[PDB]
Amino acid sequence: VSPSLIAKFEKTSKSNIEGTIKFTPANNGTVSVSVDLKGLPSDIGPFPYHVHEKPVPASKNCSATENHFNPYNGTVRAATPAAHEVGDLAGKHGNIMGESYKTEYDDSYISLNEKSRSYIGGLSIVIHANNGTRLNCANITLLDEGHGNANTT
Ligand SMILES: [Cu+2]
C-alpha cells in the first residue's frame, strides 16, 4: 500500500493562507483528501485549487509550479468528474470558499502509487483567487517519518 502525502501551506508576506491538505489511501481504490485551511483573503474567492506539475521552489514563487497536472488530457469544465484533469481538485470537488475551509472527500483519479501515471507525489498544490491569481502554494511531501514493514512511526 502507498504512503500518505501532505501539502503544508505556510503564511508569508505574500499570503495569510495556512493549513494542510492531506492525502491518505482509502477503500475502493480512492484517495481520501482532507483540507484544513484558514487565513483565506477577503472577498476575492471562491478559490480554485489544483495539483500543478513542478515543485514550489525555495523562492516560494507559485508561478514556478507551471501548469496543471493533466496526464490524461482532461478539460477544465466538464459534465462528469473523470473528464476533469487529474490535478483539478476544485473543478471536481468544489472551490475553497470563506475565510476558513475544512472539507473531506474521496478522489478516485489522483494516485499515491509512484508507479502510477496519476501519481501526485513530488508535485505541488496552488490556491488561486477567483480571477486566477496564484495566492499560495505548497509541495506535496511524505506525511509520516517512518516506513517499512518492520518499522513504527
Ligand atoms: Cu491551479
- Tell me the technique behind this structure: X-ray
| CA angle 88–48–137, rounded 5-degree value | 90
End-to-end CA distance of the chain: 16
CA atoms of 74 and 59, how far apart (whole Å)? 30
Cα 129 to middle of ligand 1, angstroms: 10
Cα 138 to middle of ligand 1, angstroms: 12
Cα 135 to middle of ligand 1, angstroms: 10
CA atoms of 90 and 76, how far apart (whole Å)? 10
Cα 126 to middle of ligand 1, angstroms: 5
| Resolution, expressed in angstroms to one decimal | 1.8
Cell 490524461, residue?
Answer: 72
For the annotated binding site, the residues are 50, 52, 68, 128
Cα 25 to middle of ligand 1, angstroms: 23
Extended strands (E) in the chain: 5-9, 18-25, 31-38, 49-52, 101-107, 124-128, 134-142
CATH of region 1-153: 2.60.40.200
C-alpha cell at 7: 501539502
